[PDB]
Amino acid sequence: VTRIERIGAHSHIRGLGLDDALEPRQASQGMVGQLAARRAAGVVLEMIREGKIAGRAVLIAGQPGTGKTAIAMGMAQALGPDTPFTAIAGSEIFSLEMSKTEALTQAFRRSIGVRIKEETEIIEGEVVEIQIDKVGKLTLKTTEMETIYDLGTKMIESLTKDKVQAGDVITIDKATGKISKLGRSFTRARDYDAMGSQTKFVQCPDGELQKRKEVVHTVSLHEIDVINSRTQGFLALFSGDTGEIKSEVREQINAKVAEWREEGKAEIIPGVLFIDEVHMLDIESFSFLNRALESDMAPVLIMATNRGITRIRGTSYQSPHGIPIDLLDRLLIVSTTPYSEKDTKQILRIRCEEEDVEMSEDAYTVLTRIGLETSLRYAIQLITAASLVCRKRKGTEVQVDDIKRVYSLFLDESRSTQYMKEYQ
Amino acid sequence: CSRTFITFSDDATFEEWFPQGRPPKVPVREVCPVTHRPALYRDPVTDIPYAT
Ligand SMILES: Nc1ncnc2c1ncn2[C@@H]1O[C@H](COP(=O)(O)OP(=O)(O)O)[C@@H](O)[C@H]1O
């Protein structure tokens, strides 16, 4: 059975392949090579997991095909879902409902987690009878025991306007927010022909009628948008409200989160913001990142770029990696070297393992020699293409003559550009 | 000075609405007849208060 997530480009990278001493292995859990780069990535991963210091920023630089994105996925799989890992491309901040700066702020805050723990007294049971005269009584049941409660006017008004009825499995808290839980299985056969879309029939509780709810849940600090409007959780399902006021973001939510942390009702777990293709940012966004990194509770930035000395967007100026010098001063730069005849063959072997393709050692030799001439990223695509061309030939293993069947159908950037002698 | 009066020049009953009485809520913590804990519930079928 095929599921939502299937074999993508970085699917084989199940982690960052490092020893307990952070020493990288020759070939380990998905990743191959890049010893220097993977050791550096492991170190910044460790400072992510410690969490003590704020606004650290790392730039993964190097040529196309070294493993910058691969290393980022290694870091992201090595890190558990507990710590928020936010991945965007630099192109995603170029919004219409927001400015560059506000979108970048929202990403920063999406990279900070807050583990709520909430602890509430609850009354739960099947309603046996309701009476109303205004005042009345309510008979609640759990499979263990039954009780009466006397109702005041607010409780009565939230029985009637809720249209609670005999048989409803009801649930009530201190400072009541009464929610209907289920429908009794005795007042049944209602679906002899129909049920309401919200109605359920699962059975009444057991044990004591009064219990305690523990609820634990990681929101991101971007839960600021949960208080930017009248009804506001909606905007977490449609991106909605755009520039929510800084006067509520930076003091009210941070202050109340600190109060929760001190009482013990919450804890910030700072995570990662990975901006891929970061060269796409404008000097406005870069100069914003300048101050954003200095802030008290920024995540760690990871950036990836493949640019040389190039023009900074929004300027006529040229700089390393296409990002300003005043921001490179704020980064630690991890360089990535290309692969040789030894590591190209091995990552092709890994990709065959992931895509479940079997190749002749001749075919591996040919595919490596082809990848070392045109592009690494192309030899990975020929794997699947040859698997398919060999599947129709009534074969079971990709063969040297099949790599050539693919090699002439799907032509590289090199040969593709070389055949533009026609100039239509 | 500028002092204020309200006179119920009508039937004194309209003042009698307000004074006298002022009782407490007489009941106090009831003890269950089995474990002798202070009660949390009252059984609809007996009206006996109980805890466990
Ligand atoms: N260290 C590695 N281990 C395993 N596979 C790799 C490694 N580096 C690159 N690859 C493969 O080669 C492809 C190119 O690397 P990628 O990181 O996407 O390029 P870039 O460095 O430009 O981001 C990846 O999509 C992945 O399939």
Strands A85-89 and B41-42: unpaired
The SS3 of residue A301 is strand
Ligand 1 pocket: which of A276, A335, A347 to mutate (most atoms within 8 A of CB): A347
What is the b/e burial string over A223-236, where b = at least 16 CB atoms within 10 angstroms of the residue's CB? Answer: bbbeebeeebeebe
CB A113 within 8 A of CB A270: yes
- The whole-angstrom separation of Cα A243 and Cα A99 is 8
The SS3 of residue A221 is helix
Pick the closest to residue A367 from A320, A321, A400 (CA basis): A400
Radius of gyration for the alpha carbons in chain A, expressed in angstroms and rounded: 29
DSSP 8-state symbol, A369: H
Residue with tokens 């009637």: A160
Query: Measured over all CA atoms, what is the biggest interatomic distance in chain B, rounded to whole angstroms?
Result: 67
CB A313 within 8 A of CB A281: yes
CB A268 within 8 A of CB A257: yes
Pick the closest to residue A275 from A114, A115, A113, A103 (CA basis): A103
- The CA A134 to ligand 1 mean position distance, Å, reads 72
What DSSP line would sit under A137-167, residue for residue? EEEEEETTEEEEEEE-HHHHHHHHTTT--TT
What DSSP line would sit under A260-282, residue for residue? HHHHTS--EEE-EEEEETGGG-B
The SS3 of residue A200 is coil
User: Residue B26 burial by CB count (10 A; 0-12/13-18/19+): exposed, middle or buried?
Assistant: exposed
Strands B41-42 and B49-50: antiparallel
Q: Does B41 touch chain A (CB under 8 A)?
A: yes
- The whole-angstrom separation of Cα A126 and Cα A204 is 6
Task: Give bridge partners of residue A26 from the DSSP assignment.
Answer: none
Ligand 1 pocket: which of A336, A377, A378, A384 to mutate (most atoms within 8 A of CB): A377
What letter represents residue A11's amino acid? Answer: S
- The whole-angstrom separation of Cα A359 and Cα A367 is 10
Give the count of beta carbons closer than 10 Å to the beta carbon of residue A333.
Answer: 16
According to CATH, the topology of domain A340-424 is Helicase, Ruva Protein; domain 3 (1.10.8)
What is the b/e burial string over A25-37, where b = at least 16 CB atoms within 10 angstroms of the residue's CB? Answer: eeebebbbbbeeb
CB A343 within 8 A of CB A33: yes
Residue with tokens 């009530």: A172
- The whole-angstrom separation of Cα A270 and Cα A85 is 9
CB A408 within 8 A of CB A402: no
- The whole-angstrom separation of Cα A249 and Cα A238 is 19
Closest alpha carbon within chain A to B48: A147
Report the CATH number of the A8-112+220-339 domain: 3.40.50.300
The half-sphere exposure of A406 on its side-chain side, counting CA atoms within 13 A, is 26
CB A17 within 8 A of CB A39: no
CB A169 within 8 A of CB A154: no
**CB neighbours of A40 closer than 8 A, spacing ≥ 6?**
A58, A334
CB A14 within 8 A of CB A28: no
Structure tokens at A37: 């780069």
The half-sphere exposure of A10 on its side-chain side, counting CA atoms within 13 A, is 18
- The whole-angstrom separation of Cα A348 and Cα A162 is 62
Structure tokens at A19: 């020893």
Question: Residue B41: which of A128, A129, A147 has the nearest Cβ?
Answer: A147
Give the count of beta carbons closer than 10 Å to the beta carbon of residue A311.
Answer: 13
Structure tokens at A179: 């929610």
Structure tokens at A43: 């170190």
What is the b/e burial string over A157-190, where b = at least 16 CB atoms within 10 angstroms of the residue's CB? Answer: eebeeeebeebbbbbbeeeeebebbbbbeeeeee
Closest alpha carbon within chain A to B39: A147
Cβ of A7 below 6 Å from ligand 1: no
Virtual torsion, Cα A268, A270, A271, A276, nearest 10 deg: 120
Question: ∠A114-A116-A120 over CA atoms, to 5°?
Answer: 170
The half-sphere exposure of B37 on its side-chain side, counting CA atoms within 13 A, is 7
Residue with tokens 């239509």: A424
Domain with CATH 3.40.50.300 in chain A: 8-112+220-339
- The whole-angstrom separation of Cα A289 and Cα A108 is 10
Helix (H), strand (E), coil (C) string for A52-85: CCCCCEEEEEECCCCCHHHHHHHHHHHCCCCCCE
Backbone torsions φ then ψ of A206, nearest 5 degrees? -130, 165
Taking contacts as CB-CB distances below 8 angstroms, the residues of chain A near B43 are 145-148
Give, to the nearest 10 degrees, the angle between helix A283-293 and helix A100-110.
Answer: 40
CB A178 within 8 A of CB A154: no
Give, to the nearest 10 degrees, the angle between helix A361-371 and helix A400-407.
Answer: 30
Residue with tokens 């790392």: A58
| Cα-Cα end-to-end distance for chain A | 46
Give the count of beta carbons closer than 10 Å to the beta carbon of residue A418.
Answer: 10
Cβ of A377 below 6 Å from ligand 1: yes
Taking contacts as CB-CB distances below 8 angstroms, the residues of chain B near A148 are 41-44, 47
Pick the closest to residue A67 from A351, A310, A363 (CA basis): A351
CB A122 within 8 A of CB A215: no
Positive or negative torsion for Cα A65, A68, A69, A73: positive
Please give the method by which this entry was determined. cryo-EM
- The CA A112 to ligand 1 mean position distance, Å, reads 28
DSSP 8-state symbol, A307: -
CB B21 within 8 A of CB B36: no
Domain with CATH 1.10.8.60 in chain A: 340-424
